[PDB]
C-alpha cells in the first residue's frame, strides 16, 4: 500500500480540526469503501511528559504526533474503554505527491470558515485510515463531565463546585463573553445518571439547544447543529426542516418523527452502557484540579504558586500517577460520542413501539486527544475563572 497522485482523485474533503484534515472515500475500491483518511496539517514529547508517560515506552518513543495519538488511543485509551467502541485506525503509507495533490484539493474545496487554514503537511509520509462513523443517521454528542466533585481540596469559597456541574457554571461565563445565544437546558448529570427518564430529558435538551454538543448527520451531511456553539435555540424553521429530513428513515406521520428520533437516540445511549465506562475514566480525576495542580508543580520541579502541605510530601511516583490519571480523565471529559443508526425494513438494535421499527446502531468514542502536561496550568486557570464568576454572579 502506497497512496499517490491518481488516488487523490478518490477522496473528498469532509472536515478538519486545528491539527488534522479528514477526507472521505469517493472511489470504488472494496478496500476504502466506508473509510475516511486523516491527514496531518503543517504547524508553526517533552522530557517531563516522557517521564510522566515512561510506563508506556512505545508512546514516548513515537517519532511524530500522528503515531503518538494512535498509540495513546491504542495503548492507554483502549485498555480503559475497550476496543468495541474505539477505532484507533490503520496507518497507511503516503507519497509526498499524494499530499501535494490533497493540498491543492483542500484549498479549493474548504468552506469559508476554513479558507485560510494551514496547508497539508507534505513532509509527512503516512496517514491514518479509519472507519467512517457516518456511514445512516449519525448523532454526535459532546457530553462533558458527568459527575460532581466531592474533593477535600476544594476550598470553602468554591463550594458551589460540589453542588453545581462544571457545565452549568461554564454556561454563565460563555453567556457573559457572548459565546452562546442563551443558556442550554442540557445537564450532563442527567445524561450520565443511568436513569432512562433523565437521559431522554438530556437528549431533548441537547436537541433544543445544540450549541457545540449536539449534531445530527444524514449520510455524513449535517442536518442539525454544526458550526456555531454560537448558533441559537432550535427554531420553528430549523425544527420543521429537521422533522422533514427524518422522513423515510423514521416511519411516523409528518410532525411525529422528531419525538421518535429523540427516543431512539435516548434508548441507544442508555442501552449501550457507553456512558458508564466513560464516567469511570472521567473519575480518574480523583482529586479535582485544585488537588492535582499541586502534584503538577512537583513534576516540573518549580515552587507552587497555589500554596495543601501533604500533597507535596508524596513520593514522586505517586505524583506522576495522579497527573497522569487527571490527564486521561481530561481526554474522557473532552471526547465525543458518535451514534450511528440504520433502519431495518420488515424483512445491537433498538425498537420503537408505536412505529414497529428496528434500528441497527454502533457507538464510538471520537476526539480522544492526548492532553499536554503543560495544559494543567490552563485547566487550573479556567477552573478558577469559572467558580469565581459563578460565585460573583450568585
Ligand atoms: Zn501546592
Swiss-Prot record:
Listed GO MF terms: ATP binding; inositol-1,3,4,5,6-pentakisphosphate 2-kinase activity; inositol-1,3,4,6-tetrakisphosphate 2-kinase activity; inositol-1,4,5,6-tetrakisphosphate 2-kinase activity; metal ion binding
Tissue: Strongly expressed in leaves and cauline leaves. Weakly expressed in siliques and flowers. In flower, it is expressed in the major organs of developing flower buds. Strongly expressed in sepals, petals, in the male and female organs of immature and mature flower buds. Strongly expressed in the gynoecium and carpels which are fused to form the gynoecium. Also expressed in the transmitting tissue and ovules.
Recorded GO CC terms: cytoplasm; nucleus
Cofactor(s) in the UniProt record: Zn(2+)
EC nos: 2.7.1.158
Motif EXKPK motif boundaries: 140-144
Record's cofactor remark: Binds 1 zinc ion per subunit.
Positions with a binding annotation for substrate: 43, 114, 144, 174, 212, 334, 371, 375, 379
BP GO terms, sorted: defense response to bacterium; defense response to fungus; defense response to virus; intracellular phosphate ion homeostasis; lateral root development; myo-inositol hexakisphosphate biosynthetic process; phosphate ion homeostasis
Broad class of enzyme this protein falls into: transferase
Residue numbers binding ATP: 17-20, 38, 131-133, 140-142, 215, 367
Amino-acid positions noted as binding Zn(2+) in the UniProt annotation, renumbered to this chain: 294, 304, 307, 312
Gene3D superfamilies linked: Inositol-pentakisphosphate 2-kinase, N-lobe
Pfam families recorded: Ins_P5_2-kin (PF06090)
PANTHER family named in the record: INOSITOL POLYPHOSPHATE KINASE 1 (PTHR14456), INOSITOL-PENTAKISPHOSPHATE 2-KINASE (PTHR14456:SF2)
Domains (record comment): The EXKPK motif is conserved in inositol-pentakisphosphate 2-kinases of both family 1 and 2.
Protein name: Inositol-pentakisphosphate 2-kinase
Name of encoding gene: IPK1
